[PDB]
Structures are given as structure tokens and as C-alpha cells.
Amino acid sequence: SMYVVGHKIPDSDSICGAIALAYLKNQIGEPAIAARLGELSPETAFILEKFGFEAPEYKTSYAGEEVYIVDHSEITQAPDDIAQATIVGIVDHHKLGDLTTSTPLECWIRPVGCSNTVIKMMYDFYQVKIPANIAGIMMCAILSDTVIFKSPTCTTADIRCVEALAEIAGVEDFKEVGMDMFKVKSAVEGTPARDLVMRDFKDFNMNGNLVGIGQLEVIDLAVFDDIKADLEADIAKLKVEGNRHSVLLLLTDIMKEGSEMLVVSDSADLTERAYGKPTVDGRVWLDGVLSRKKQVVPALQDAFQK
Ligand SMILES: [Ca+2]
Ligand SMILES: [F-]
Ligand SMILES: [Mg+2]
Ligand SMILES: [Mg+2]
Ligand SMILES: [Mg+2]
Ligand SMILES: [Mg+2]
Ligand SMILES: [Mg+2]
């Protein structure tokens, strides 16, 4: 079987998309196994419990295997031994990263709100029925990635996909399922700083500079008031531990629709140069910023390339 696997530090799109695409591949006679590179977030556990799924197989070494990548195209987010695997496919909605192959492959990459929107397009292409349970987790993944349609990554395709999947899944009030997921994400009391920094964290190679970016999407920024200094101390430790150029942590309020970014960087003017918004003692408020892939990464990557 091929293994279908999303990014390191998987989120709901990576987990649910691996399950949904493995099902589709098996239905079309292409043996597949869904896998994961890490533990589930509370949000993803909530989604899988709601629709009756077990977590996919936890698997970290893929040398000699065929792999269908979900929800990224980056060396830093792939299995460590992906160069000794064969990538047979990528389904994604990110920038084109530094993965490569030696062989022809499939890529279903679209600049939409969720990888699961593209996986639904694959089900449509093959004319395979989406079971109710699979539809539910796909629906949840799109509601999560699009921030209940608030994110600027959201497209008409994502909305139409949620509407179609919600009908299949038997969900009438899908926006309340969306809000439920963000209430789960907001339940951060008593969680160690490092577990919050790493909950939704990605490394990026930006012109040979290693940049770590975490994100914590919540309903109310004030949940971070007491732990903010602990988060700041922790990102400085994480910077050193991984010999990173920069570590950024987005504290994202989905109701204000903006983010406070905590910054530790070898570049004193990083956010001034990237966004035209200077940090002050390592913090900057980024009005309107919800999306890492659309509103955070591009300007940073371009600033490192220049
Ligand atoms: Ca490439
Ligand atoms: F995702
Ligand atoms: Mg993801
Ligand atoms: Mg995604
Ligand atoms: Mg996501
Ligand atoms: Mg995300
Ligand atoms: Mg969570």
C-alpha cells in the first residue's frame, strides 16, 4: 500500500485528509494506508471522536515506501527519510516547496482554503461516493482551515464543498460545528508553554534560514495574558534548540480577525521589513491576519530571498 500522510505536527486537514484520500484510493483499487507523523491536537481528536474514527497509524520512517503527501510540499514538514521514499502524489493548497522527485507523480494543488476541498474534487473526478462519516471529517477540516469561512484563504469552492459535505454527513448547522472546533482550540488552561508553542508549529527553509512559526487560534486573545511571558521565554529556547534564524508565534483571535505575533529573530527589523510593522519588545499586532500560508509566509519568504 501507499501511505497517505500530511505534515509534521499534523492538524485536522492533514489527519482527515489522509483518512479521506486513503479511502478514495482503496475504492479505486489503489491500495492505501492513512498515516500520521505526530499526535493529534485536541481539535482533531474532537473531530475524529464525533464521526467515529480512530487516529491513523503513527509512522515516521517511509524509506522504500510510496507516499502520497497531503497539505504541504516542504522537506521540513515531510518525513525525515522522504528522499529514500517515492512520492507518488501531492494534494495541497500551499506554496510550492522544496520537495522533489526523480519520477513523474500526481499533484492536485489548488490555491483554496483546505486540502480536503481538493480531495472532494478528487472524489468527484473518480465518481466515488463519499460516506457520511468521511464527509463529516472532511467538512470539519474545511471549517477549521477556513476559520468558519473568515480566513482570506476561503474560496467559493470551499463554501460549496462544506455545504455539499454537510448534507452528506447529516449536519444542518455546520457553522456551529465550526465554532465548536474553535472553542476546543481555545481550551488552553494548564497547558505547558512548550506544548502550546508546538501545537500548530511549522519549520520553513527561507533561502537557507530556518524559520519556525507557531499559531494558536482562539476565540479570545485574553486567554494568553497570564502565560504570554512564558511563551516568549519558550520561543527563545526553541530558537536555540533548533539553531533557527527566527521563531514566530501567532496568537490569533478569530473574532477580532487579527494576530499578535511574538518574535525572536537574528534580524532585529524582521517584521518592519516583511510587513511594514515593527516589533516593539518582540511583539507586533497584525490587524486582519488569520492565515499563515497567505498573510505571514509569503512576505517573510520574499524578505529572505532579497
Ligand atoms: Ca520543488
Ligand atoms: F491544514
Ligand atoms: Mg495543515
Ligand atoms: Mg491545510
Ligand atoms: Mg490546517
Ligand atoms: Mg493552519
Ligand atoms: Mg486544539
Residue numbers in the entry: 2 to 307
Any passages from the paper?
Inorganic pyrophosphatase (PPase) catalyses the hydrolysis reaction of inorganic pyrophosphate (PPi) to two inorganic phosphates (Pi) and plays an essential role for living organisms. We previously reported the expression and purification of family II PPase from the psychrophilic Shewanella sp. Sh-PPase activated by Mn2+ ions (Mn-Sh-PPase) displayed the highest activity at 5 °C, which is characteristic of cold-adapted enzymes. X-ray crystallography and EPR spectroscopy were used to investigate a cold-adapted family II Sh-PPase from a psychrophilic bacterium that lives in the Southern Ocean.
In contrast, Sh-PPase activated by Mg2+ ions (Mg-Sh-PPase) has much lower catalytic activity with PPi or PNP than Mn-Sh-PPase13, and we obtained well-diffracted crystals of Mg-Sh-PPase in the presence of PNP and sodium fluoride. The electron density unambiguously showed that the PNP and four Mg2+ atoms were bound to the di-metal centre of Sh-PPase. In the crystal structure of Mg-Sh-PPase with PNP, the bridged water between Mg2+ ions at M1 and M2 is assumed to be replaced by a fluoride ion. An anomalous difference Fourier map indicated that M1 and M2 metal sites in the crystal structure of Mg-Sh-PPase contain a small fraction of metals other than Mg2+. Based on the anomalous scattering factor of these elements (f ″ = 0.24 for S; f ″ = 1.6 for Fe) at an X-ray wavelength of 1.0 Å, M1 and M2 were occupied by Fe with an estimated content of 15% and 7%, respectively. The M1 site was converted to the 6-coordinated slight rhombic octahedral geometry by binding of PNP, and the M2 site was changed to a nearly axial octahedral coordination sphere. In addition, a bridged water in the crystal structure of Mg-Sh-PPase with PNP, as well as Bs-PPase, shows the formation of unique tri-metal coordination sphere, where it is bound with 3 metal ions (M1, M2 and M4).
